[PDB]
């Protein structure tokens, strides 16, 4: 079982335990749920000499700590508060095992912390081991976190091989629960020459993406943070389909974001389209106000519709105000309307 020192520490025998006092017991403490937290907190404010004593004791088996549920935290604290020499030695211990660590539940967090704190040179040395394994890491439950961090932290020129690996795979990655997150990071951090081919593939498949459970969020991202040129292409895809996409579980989110982020003229064209559109025995507005998803698009269209059109819109809603109150969704509208 545990050493007596660790057992006593866990039983609160030592209210002032110090790092120097756990000499010889550091690997064990690092892999203990409470011993690890103790070391994590102490390293935050230990003197550099105190950090080195801890380090000298774990260096030889650092890799073992890297893949341990509690030991990985101690390794991370070194990248966070340690000396350049310690980070360098850890990077050297990581060399040749970046892929293995990136795919490991705890090791992936060590790689992420290292990327955030090591020099461009060692970042490049680490990211390059992923060459030929990009798509696998992007889709992996642990590996996607490493790829996302590379995108946020590494010089863009060193990320070119990752962009290259996405050629023709943007639709598949955007409809993946882990891959969609990597695509969003690319859009936020990469250079225009790198985001261009990605956006090109997103635009090509917008029709399918807006209806996908994960894909719609990538499109929403472009609507929320993208360039006007890109937002306009997406709006163009929604134009003429406001009625049908509004009633879609996922596409309705994109339609909503279009109303919110399209140009002045664009929002107009879209709102207009909903008033003059028909849906069988009634108007488009009619069907939408009471739909569980489409109702939000109607609400938001109000909050954004320029006074001129706002009148018209409602002028077409009142007549049905009776049947309106017959629904849970039409009440948010029932409210706003009353004014």
The β-bridge partners of 129 are: none
Other CB atoms within 10 Å distance of the CB of residue 219: 29
CA 278 to chain centre: 39
Per the structure, how many domains does the chain have?
A: 1
Alpha helix segments (H runs only) across 128-250: 134-139, 143-153, 160-165, 170-174, 179-189, 192-204, 206-209, 215-225, 228-238, 242-246
What is the Cα–Cα distance from 164 to 186, expressed in whole angstroms?
12
Can you give the length of the chain in residues?
Answer: 339
Q: What is the DSSP letter of 283?
A: E
Q: Which residue has the tokens 């390059």?
A: 128
CB of 65 closer than 8 Å to CB of 30 = yes
What is the Cα–Cα distance from 26 to 56, expressed in whole angstroms?
10
SS (H, E, C) 173-199: HHCCCCHHHHHHHHHHHCCHHHHHHHH
Q: What is the DSSP letter of 282?
A: E
CATH number, domain containing residue 334? 1.25.10.10
What is the Cα–Cα distance from 159 to 190, expressed in whole angstroms?
8
Which domain does 254 fall in, by range? 1-339
Structure determination technique employed: X-ray
Resolution of the coordinates in A? 1.9
Long-range contacts of 20-23 (CB under 8 A, 24+ apart): 20/50, 20/53, 23/53, 23/57
What is the Cα–Cα distance from 109 to 65, expressed in whole angstroms?
12
Helix, strand, or coil (residue 162): helix
The β-bridge partners of 278 are: 283
Sign of torsion over alpha carbons 135, 140, 143, 149 = positive
Burial class (CB in 10 A: 0-12, 13-18, 19+), 162: buried
């Amino acid at each position: 079982g545990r050493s007596r020192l660790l057992e006593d520490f866990r039983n609160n025998r030592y209210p002032n335990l110090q790092l120097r006092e756990i000499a010889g017991h550091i690997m064990e403490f690092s892999q203990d749920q409470h011993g690890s937290r103790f070391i994590q907190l102490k390293l935050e404010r230990a003197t550099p000499a105190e950090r080195q004593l801890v380090f000298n004791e774990i260096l030889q088996a650092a890799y073992q700590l890297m893949v341990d549920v509690f030991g990985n935290y101690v390794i991370q604290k070194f990248f966070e508060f340690g000396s350049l020499e310690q980070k360098l030695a850890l990077a050297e211990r990581i060399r040749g095992h970046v892929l293995s660590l990136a795919l490991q539940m705890y090791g992936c967090r060590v790689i992420q912390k290292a990327l955030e704190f090591i020099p461009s040179d060692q970042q490049n040395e680490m990211v390059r081991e992923l060459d030929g394994h990009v798509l696998k890491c992007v889709k992996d439950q642990n590996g996607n976190h490493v790829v996302q961090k590379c995108i946020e932290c590494v010089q863009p020129q060193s990320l070119q091989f990752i962009i290259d690996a996405f050629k023709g795979q943007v639709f598949a990655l955007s409809t993946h629960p882990y891959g969609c997150r990597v695509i969003q990071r690319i859009l936020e951090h990469c250079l225009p020459d790198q985001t261009l081919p990605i956006l090109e593939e997103l635009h090509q498949h917008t029709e399918q993406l807006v209806q996908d459970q994960y894909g719609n969020y990538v499109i929403q991202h472009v609507l929320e943070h993208g360039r006007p040129e890109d937002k306009s292409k997406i709006v163009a895809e929604i134009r003429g389909n406001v009625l049908v996409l509004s009633q879609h579980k996922f596409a309705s989110n994109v339609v909503e974001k279009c109303v919110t982020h399209a140009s002045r003229t664009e929002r107009a064209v879209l709102i207009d389209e909903v008033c003059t559109m028909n849906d069988g025995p009634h108007s488009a507005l009619y069907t939408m106000m009471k739909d569980q998803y489409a109702n939000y698009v109607v609400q938001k269209m109000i909050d954004v519709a320029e006074p001129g059109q706002r009148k018209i819109v409602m002028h077409k809603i009142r007549p049905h105000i009776a049947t309106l109150r017959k629904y849970t969704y039409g009440k948010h509208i029932l409210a706003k309307l009353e004014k």
